[PDB]
Design a protein around this ligand. Structure first.
Ligand SMILES: N[C@H](CO)c1cccc(-c2cccc(COc3ccccc3CC(=O)O)c2)c1
Length: 230
């Protein structure tokens, strides 16, 4: 997260750290007791290593009573996802067991009504992604409120030139933005999950290259089907 600030500890109980061999790789969102939603590209160059999900965390390195690292029993990338493509970049991770719920661990309700979030709406993005262009990795969870950018503006030749489908949404990227290590994490509007961070053009903090977020509402049928297949 560039241009953000340290989040209040455990104020986002749905926030997950998807990890590879003990290291934070991507953000994730707890959407059900045993399921974490993330981005499919996160596990592309991982196939070998131990994939785990850290729940109830503020600090990545420090002990906290609510912190718990879970093993993943199965990884469900969206069937239409392709590598190094920004479309259908969703991943569902089944935990080893149902997560112990409490004030610091709680699933987030997600948008099921397939209608765009109004442009200008301030939405909260959180993550353990890089906090400056030099690549400084924060130990503690960061967040930033970003305004939603209309698809038309986002799709201009000067911006993402037609790449923003109806299944994607954009947020302003001027200084404040999501960056490397934030994909798979949440974009929350009025307490509801609206988007999942994707890597876009892999450029951060540049107003001409807005942040790209996968609209969860567009994938309601797939998420429901995966969550129902215990
Ligand atoms: N705001 C912009 C566009 O929305 C944005 C948001 C989020 C990430 C990036 C971004 C910037 C540089 C390099 C990478 C490659 O990262 C990975 C590559 C492989 C696995 C995991 C990651 C981690 C990750 O994807 O976060 C991503 C850019």
């Amino acid at each position: 997260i560039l241009g953000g600030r340290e989040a209040e500890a455990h104020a986002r109980p749905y926030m997950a750290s998807v990890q590879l061999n003990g290291a934070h790789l991507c953000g994730g969102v707890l959407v059900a007791e045993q399921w974490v939603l993330s981005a499919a590209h996160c596990l592309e160059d991982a196939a070998d290593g131990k994939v785990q999900v850290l729940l109830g965390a503020h600090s990545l390195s420090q002990p906290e009573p609510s912190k718990r690292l879970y093993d993943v029993l199965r990884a469900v990338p969206h069937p239409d996802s392709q590598p190094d493509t920004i479309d259908h970049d969703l991943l569902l991770l089944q935990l080893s067991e149902k997560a112990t719920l409490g004030p610091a661990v709680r699933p987030l309700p997600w948008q099921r009504v397939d209608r765009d979030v109004a442009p200008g709406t301030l939405c909260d993005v959180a993550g353990w992604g890089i906090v400056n262009h030099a690549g400084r990795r924060p130990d503690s969870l960061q967040h930033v409120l970003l305004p939603v950018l209309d698809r038309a503006t986002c799709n201009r030749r000067t911006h993402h030139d037609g790449a923003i489908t109806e299944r994607l949404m954009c947020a302003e990227s001027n200084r404040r933005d999501s960056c490397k290590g934030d994909s798979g994490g949440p974009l929350v509007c009025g307490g509801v999950l609206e988007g999942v961070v994707t890597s876009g053009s892999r450029v951060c903090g540049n107003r001409k290259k807005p942040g790209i977020y996968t609209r969860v509402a567009s994938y309601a049928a797939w998420i429901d089907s995966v969550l129902a297949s215990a």
